[PDB]
A paper describes a structure:
CqsR, however, is regulated by ethanolamine, which is produced by V. cholerae and the host. In V. cholerae, ethanolamine binding to the periplasmic domain of the receptor CqsR controls quorum sensing and infection site selectivity in the host.
To understand the mechanistic basis of ethanolamine recognition by CqsR, we determined the 1.55 Å resolution X-ray crystal structure of the CqsR periplasmic domain (CqsRp) in complex with ethanolamine. Electron density corresponding to ethanolamine revealed that it binds to the core of the membrane distal domain. The ethanolamine binding site consists of a hydrophilic platform and a hydrophobic lid. More specifically, the acidic side chain of CqsR-D198 plays a critical role, serving to coordinate both the ethanolamine amine and hydroxyl. As both ethanolamine functional groups are chelated by Asp198, this enforces a higher energy gauche configuration for the ligand. CqsR residues Tyr169, Asp171, and Thr196 mediate additional contacts with ethanolamine. The aromatic hydrophobic side chains of residues Trp105, Phe123, Trp138, and Trp151 form a lid above ethanolamine, with the face of Trp151 prominently positioned to engage in hydrophobic contacts with the ethanolamine alkane carbon atoms. When ethanolamine binds to the membrane-distal Cache domain, it triggers a reorientation of residues in the binding site.
Numbering used by the authors: 44 to 127, 131 to 260
Write the structure that this text describes.
């Protein structure tokens, strides 16, 4: 019944939103590493999030904060965009609210080597209210860590894509993330010695188990 082949076909599709997110992150880091000023970066980021598709829903640039600045509005200067049209949000730069430099997705990438990517736990962004997984990476300027870039994946969009693809291939699938959270479970069950095909994504530390659908 070609289960292993169809499971590989499904894994290739599941890899697409994740490879897509990595590519967008590479574009974000190019912008963060550049000599463009704040307004030029805002324009490029707005354009970038306007053209990207798939499961990508928000993200942007998170400069290393200056917590010692006397003006509270100068401490945090993230460039964060949300795909509704594309809106720029300032909500994460609220000094009263702790800023962003202690968030899991910032800390994972902080001062890490360029070219490494980090995947957050599932969470609901407190300002866009979208349930999401974030991929992040550091960027540098003049040899020094300068900030974190992020891309947010819509969990709802990811679920729909994986389930619809598995249905098309007449498969059931469970997809778990690196924290053991069940991202998607679509028509998956085992009985009467049903074969299960397992695949581990080596770059993302995610896991799928696949069965034939009846
Ligand atoms: Cl689900």
């Amino acid at each position: 019944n070609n289960l292993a082949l169809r499971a590989e076909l499904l894994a290739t599709q599941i890899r697409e939103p994740l490879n897509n997110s990595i590519g967008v992150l590479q574009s974000l880091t190019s912008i963060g590493k550049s000599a463009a000023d704040k307004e030029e970066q805002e324009r490029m980021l707005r354009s970038l999030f306007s053209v990207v598709g798939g499961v990508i829903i928000s993200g942007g640039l998170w400069p290393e904060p200056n917590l010692s600045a006397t003006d509270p509005s100068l401490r945090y200067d993230s460039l964060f965009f949300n795909k509704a049209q594309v809106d720029q949000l300032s909500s994460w730069n609220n000094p009263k609210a702790g800023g962003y430099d202690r968030e899991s997705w910032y800390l994972a990438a902080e001062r890490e080597a360029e070219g490494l990517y980090f995947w957050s736990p599932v969470y609901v962004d407190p300002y866009t209210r979208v349930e999401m997984i974030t991929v992040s990476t550091p960027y540098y300027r003049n040899g020094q860590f300068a900030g974190v870039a992020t891309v947010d994946l819509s969990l709802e969009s990811l679920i729909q894509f994986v389930a619809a693809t598995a249905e098309q291939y007449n498969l059931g699938v469970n997809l778990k993330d690196a924290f053991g959270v069940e991202v998607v479970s679509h028509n998956f069950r085992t009985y009467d010695n049903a074969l299960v095909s397992y695949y581990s994504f080596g770059e993302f530390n995610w896991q799928i188990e696949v069965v034939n659908a009846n």
